[PDB]
C-alpha cells in the first residue's frame, strides 16, 4: 500500500508546463526514502518542511505536479518568484509548504522536442492555476476572430531543446510535492 511516487518521477513522458500534470495521492503509506536519497536530482528545494521528517509526519493529501522547463526557469518554481514560467505557467503560493525537485533530462527530452510554455497573458496566474487556453492573444482593441496576425499572437511558444545547447537551455524535468493539511482525517503518512 505504498503511494505511487514512481509513476510520477519515473514516468516515460512528461507534460508541458502550461498544461502541467497533477497527481493526487491519498489513502496510502508514503516511503519518501526511495525517492529522497537518490542523488540523481540537480535541485531539491524545500519550503516550510524538511524531507528528514517527511517519512514520519502526516497529511490529508499530497500533490505531485509534473512538467518540463529550462534550466534558467527552474529557479522560478518557488514562492515569491517572478518570470515567464512563474507568472504565466505555474505559480506557487507564498505560504507554500512542499518541495521542488528538478533534474536534467537532456538524454530523454532533447532531440537533434514538443514542450511548450505560455508566452502571453494579460494577468499573472493565481497559485496552483492551470491555463490550457489556445485562444488567440489580443494585443490590441480589434478582435482577432481566431487567426494569428497583427496585434494577435499565438499565446504558446515552443522550447528549442537541442542536445548541443548550454546547460541552461537543456530540458529539466520538475516535480513539485505539496503537502495538504486541513480539518479532515489524514490519509497519507510515512512508515511511522
Amino acid at each position, epitope marked *: 500500500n505504498l503511494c505511487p511516487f514512481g509513476e510520477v518521477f519515473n514516468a516515460t513522458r512528461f507534460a508541458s508546463v502550461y498544461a502541467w500534470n497533477r497527481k493526487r495521492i491519498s489513502n496510502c503509506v508514503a516511503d519518501y526514502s526511495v525517492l*529522497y*536519497n537518490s*542523488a540523481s*536530482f*540537480s*535541485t*531539491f*528545494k*524545500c*519550503y*516550510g*518542511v*524538511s*524531507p*528528514t*521528517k517527511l517519512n514520519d509526519l502526516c497529511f490529508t493529501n499530497v500533490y505531485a505536479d509534473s512538467f518540463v522547463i529550462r534550466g534558467d526557469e*527552474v*529557479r522560478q518554481i518557488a514562492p515569491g518568484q517572478t518570470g515567464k514560467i512563474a507568472d504565466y505557467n505555474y505559480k506557487l503560493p507564498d*505560504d507554500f*509548504t512542499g*518541495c521542488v525537485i528538478a533534474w536534467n533530462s537532456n538524454n530523454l527530452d532533447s532531440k537533434v522536442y514538443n514542450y511548450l510554455y505560455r508566452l502571453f497573458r494579460k494577468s499573472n496566474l493565481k497559485p496552483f492555476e492551470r491555463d490550457i487556453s489556445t485562444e488567440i492573444y489580443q494585443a490590441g482593441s480589434t478582435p482577432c476572430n481566431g487567426v494569428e496576425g497583427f496585434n494577435c499572437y499565438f499565446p504558446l511558444q515552443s522550447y528549442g531543446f537541442q542536445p548541443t545547447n548550454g546547460v541552461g537551455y537543456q530540458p529539466y524535468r520538475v516535480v513539485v510535492l505539496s*503537502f495538504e*493539511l486541513l480539518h479532515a482525517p489524514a490519509t497519507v503518512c510515512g512508515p511511522k
Partner: antibody
Amino acid sequence: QMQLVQSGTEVKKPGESLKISCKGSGYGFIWYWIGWVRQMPGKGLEWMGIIYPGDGETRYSPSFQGQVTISADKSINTAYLQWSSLKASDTAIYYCAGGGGISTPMDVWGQGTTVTVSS
Amino acid sequence: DIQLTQSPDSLAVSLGERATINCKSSQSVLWSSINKNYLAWYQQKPGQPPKLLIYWASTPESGVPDRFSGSGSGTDFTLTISSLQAEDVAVYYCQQYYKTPYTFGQGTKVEIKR
C-alpha cells in the same frame, strides 16, 4: 544524518581579507540550506545569512547584508563566508549550520571557526 | 524582522527541580496552512556548538531526553526542563524560523542551585 566540518582557527590583522569554509558530508546534502551564525566572546547567537548550494540562492540579515558575503561551491559541497576588510569588531566564533530547507530548524551544526582580528 | 525576547536571562535550579524559560515573539510565527508554530529551542553547553533541542515549538528532536518539553503558541512559548541534571547546564536560545531573516533570543543561562 548529515555532518558539517569547518575550517581551522584564523588570526588576522585589521584590514586583511578572510574567507572561511564549511564542508558538508552525508546522505542528502542536496536539500540542505547552510546558514551562518556569529557569536562574539561572551555574547549570544546572531544569524548572519543562509545559502542554498544547489543554485546559490542567498539571503542576508539586514545587520549583515552589506558587509559580509556568503558563497557556495556545489561541486565540493562547501559554503563560504568572506570579509574583504576585517575590523577588530569581527573577533568571534562563526558557526556553519544546516537545515533541510527554508523555514526549517538547524538540525546539523559545524564545530565552529574561531576568528581573532587584532593589531 | 521578528524579534524574540526570552526571560529570565539567568536561572538557578536545584538538581531534580524544574527550569522554565519563556520566549516572547514580537509577531506571531504560526503557519496557518500547516497549523504549526515555527519556533525552535537550542542548547549550547560551554565551549561547544549549539544543539537543536526542540522544533515546531513542541516536537523534541531525535535522541533528546524526555525531561525536555516545548510549549506555547502565538507569541508566547516556553521551554521546560523537568528534573534538571548537571549535564543540562548550558545557555538556551529560542530561534524563530517562520520567515527570513532568522532571529535568535538573547540567551538564557542555566546553572545549578546548591
